[PDB]
Design a protein around this ligand. Structure first.
Ligand SMILES: Cc1cc2nc3c(=O)[nH]c(=O)nc-3n(C[C@H](O)[C@H](O)[C@H](O)COP(=O)(O)O)c2cc1C
Length: 201
């Protein structure tokens, strides 16, 4: 029995291509794996704060008193990390905005990456502590970037996720959305088929 976490990060709400595919993933997983628990967190509808010079100190082990704002960010970081570690299958919807991930997803990563909690340093290098996960990235783009030099999102996601221990990552692409409704529909169909194959594994 698995627990599935779905992280939505688009700023386009119900018009989001990656959210539509995330919803399809959930629908198909419920159908094929009816006993599994599914948790969805919308990082745009419930925003994570920007990591600034005040919040960064909240995420360090210290005996120093924290500000109210720091205490709340620490509580949120702990909540996010507990949630991430409590689920088995992690689905990350990651649209490409100005050649980067969305800030909504980035703020989540910046509260989740914490030394001694989601990674630690050993005598022979970094070690990720978020273990036993299988990750699916659903990444939507207006243009066509896959396997080219302008896709920095894919290797960045592999790098960041691997650093915290999530090395088993399958990518689902929905590209060419900006070329119009016909190409957006083909991207949806192609990504749905990649999802079907993952759900059928
Ligand atoms: C603010 C913004 C920036 C974008 N930057 C890029 C980009 O750098 N490259 C690209 O191919 N598409 C870009 N797009 C198009 C989105 O990648 C495309 O609309 C995709 O469907 C977004 O996924 P979503 O619908 O789930 O938000 C951008 C869209 C927005 C709104």
């Amino acid at each position: 029995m698995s627990k599935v976490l779905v992280l939505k990060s688009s700023i386009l709400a119900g018009y989001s291509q990656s959210n539509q595919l995330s919803d399809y993933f959930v629908e198909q997983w419920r159908e094929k794996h009816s006993a599994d628990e599914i948790t969805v967190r919308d990082l745009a509808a419930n925003p994570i704060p920007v990591l600034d010079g005040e919040l960064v100190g909240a995420l360090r082990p210290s005996d120093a008193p924290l500000t109210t704002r720091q205490q709340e960010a620490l509580a949120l970081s702990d909540e996010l990390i507990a949630e991430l570690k409590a689920h088995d299958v992690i689905v990350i919807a990651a649209p490409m905005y100005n050649f980067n991930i969305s800030t909504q997803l980035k703020n989540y990563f910046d509260l989740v990456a914490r030394a001694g909690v989601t990674f630690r340093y050993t005598e022979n290098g970094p070690e990720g502590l978020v273990t036993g996960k299988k990750a699916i990235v659903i990444t939507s783009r207006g243009g066509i970037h896959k396997d080219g030099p302008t896709d920095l999102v894919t290797p960045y996601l592999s790098t960041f996720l691997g650093f915290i221990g999530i090395t088993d990552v399958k990518f689902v692409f929905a590209e060419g959305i900006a070329y119009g409704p016909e190409m957006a529909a083909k991207a949806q169909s192609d990504a749905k088929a990649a999802i079907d194959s993952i759900v059928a594994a």
